[PDB]
């Protein structure tokens, strides 16, 4: 008799389917001014590719997705 | 050396050191900006600008709105680009800075070793970055990081690849801008804009596309009359 | 003690053997060198005869080594560094080494990550493995947790602590930056 499957079948694929450091000086610091080159946290943007009235809809759709 | 917040709708230029308020609120120093030790030296033209997050306690966010032509290889921005050749795994695609950024052959949506993209060269791009930094060669991909191309991949054919200031789009692709509301009415189009100031654009015709690369390219400082006048040839194709 | 020259004979072949700095010709070896000769002896008693300038002896980064150097250029996949100090020896004959993307940590990790690592401009110490065949490119290794960075400037002028294994950050402001601090 048997109830479940073999192994050797059950692995094809259609079926799967240091250290730290405390500085007093330091230590509870952090950056209070940090450099950045880009203009997106700067000012908000759209999306770059859009459509109007028809062409590509997809795009449409992804306009109204990346947009809100 | 005196009042950032005097002159954040001014014409700052380069070397004039600017000082900011208080223990203190975390900022961030903007691309046209630089840091020398608690204060802001100015590195190139514009006219200063301020933001500050919906919230009080991220502080603030300064920039110049500098215009100009060249571009810089830049983390998170869309960019579009143009093949330049193929080595092996990975092909080489224009941008428009210092050097030619690089892509990987599994990095399009849905692709595998048995599965190639159809990427020929001269064939142009709509990617991003991730890895933008001034040590390094550029490593562009046309996937979201979940892994699916959130309109990224080949730009396709049949259309017009123009070229304009960078300024220029940092203010089309604004939610309030007007010329390409006005344009959704006219005549349909699709286009992207490339924020290294490259821009593609298509629609049924040619003429059409034609007069609208011209609209774009002179939008900066279009007088009524000009506009109008283009507004009543596209309204007469 | 004596200076020899690059035409003077020194010894038959039964009185001697090459070393370097020499060659031979019929039943004598003949110098090759402006320096100063030495003839070693082994335990069999057959000497062996060379010819040294030593303004600039000779060294030899080997394997088991501990060798500084200089990250100049960088890539996703390697990094390519300048020698300088052979242990403590300076050598004015600046090899030039890389290091690989695995060959990184001892962990062997690929999640590690160059540009969080590495910068070109900064001093680390490292141990070879390969010589190399064609242009003697050193390959090293930082496969340690002692080993990697040492100095590294900040975003401009300032020079960096090693607050833990992959992090530093700059004495005067305060600002994180990533790389295979060594120690």
């Known amino acids: ?68 | ?237 | 003690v004596r200076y020899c020259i690059p035409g003077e004979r020194l010894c038959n072949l039964e009185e001697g053997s090459p070393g370097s700095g020499t060659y031979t010709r019929h039943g004598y070896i003949f110098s090759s060198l402006a320096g100063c000769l030495m003839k070693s002896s082994e335990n069999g008693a057959l000497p062996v005869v060379s010819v040294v300038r030593e303004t600039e002896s000779q060294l030899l980064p080997d394997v088991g080594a501990i060798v500084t150097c200089k990250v100049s250029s960088i890539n996703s996949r390697f990094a390519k560094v300048h020698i300088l100090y052979v242990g403590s020896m300076p050598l004015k004959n600046s090899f030039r080494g890389t290091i690989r993307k695995e060959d990184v940590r001892a962990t062997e990790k690929d999640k590690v990550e160059i540009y969080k690592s590495f910068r070109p401009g900064d001093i680390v110490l490292a141990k070879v493995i390969s010589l190399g065949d064609a242009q003697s490119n050193y390959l090293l290794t930082t496969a340690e947790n002692e080993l990697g960075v040492v100095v590294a400037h900040s975003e401009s002028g300032i020079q960096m602590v090693p607050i833990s294994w992959c992090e530093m950050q700059c004495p005067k402001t305060h600002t994180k930056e990533f790389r295979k601090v060594a120690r």
């Open chain 1, 1 to 68: 008799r048997k109830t479940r499957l073999s192994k050797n079948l059950l692995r094809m694929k259609f079926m799967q389917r240091h250290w730290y450091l405390d500085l007093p000086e330091l230590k509870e610091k952090e950056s209070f001014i940090i450099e950045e080159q880009s203009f997106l946290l700067c000012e908000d943007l759209l999306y770059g590719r859009m459509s109007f009235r028809g062409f590509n809809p997809e795009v449409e759709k992804l306009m109204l997705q990346m947009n809100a």
């Open chain 2, 1 to 237: 050396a005196r009042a950032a917040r005097t002159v954040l709708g001014q014409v700052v230029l380069p070397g004039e050191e600017l000082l900011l308020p208080e223990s203190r609120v975390r900022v961030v120093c903007g691309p046209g900006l630089r840091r020398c030790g608690d204060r802001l030296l100015v590195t190139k033209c514009g006219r200063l600008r301020h933001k500050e997050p919906g919230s009080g306690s991220g502080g603030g966010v300064y920039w110049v709105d500098s215009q100009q032509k060249r571009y810089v290889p830049v983390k998170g921005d869309h960019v579009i680009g143009i093949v330049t050749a193929k080595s092996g795994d990975i092909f080489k695609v224009d941008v428009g800075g210092s050097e030619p950024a690089s892509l990987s052959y599994l990095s399009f949506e849905g692709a595998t070793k048995r599965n190639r993209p159809n990427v020929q060269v001269g064939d142009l791009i709509y990617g991003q970055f991730v890895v933008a930094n001034k040590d390094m060669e550029p490593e562009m991909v046309c996937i979201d990081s979940c892994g699916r191309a959130n309109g990224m991949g080949v730009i396709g054919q049949d259309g017009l690849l123009f070229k304009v200031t960078l300024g220029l789009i940092r203010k089309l692709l604004a939610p309030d801008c007007e010329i390409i509301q006005e344009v959704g009415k006219l005549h349909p189009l699709e286009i992207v804009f490339g924020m290294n100031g490259r821009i593609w654009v298509k629609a049924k015709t040619i003429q059409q596309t034609l007069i609208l690369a011209n609209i774009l390219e002179a939008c900066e400082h279009m007088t009524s009359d000009q506009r109008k006048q283009i507004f009543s040839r596209l309204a007469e194709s």
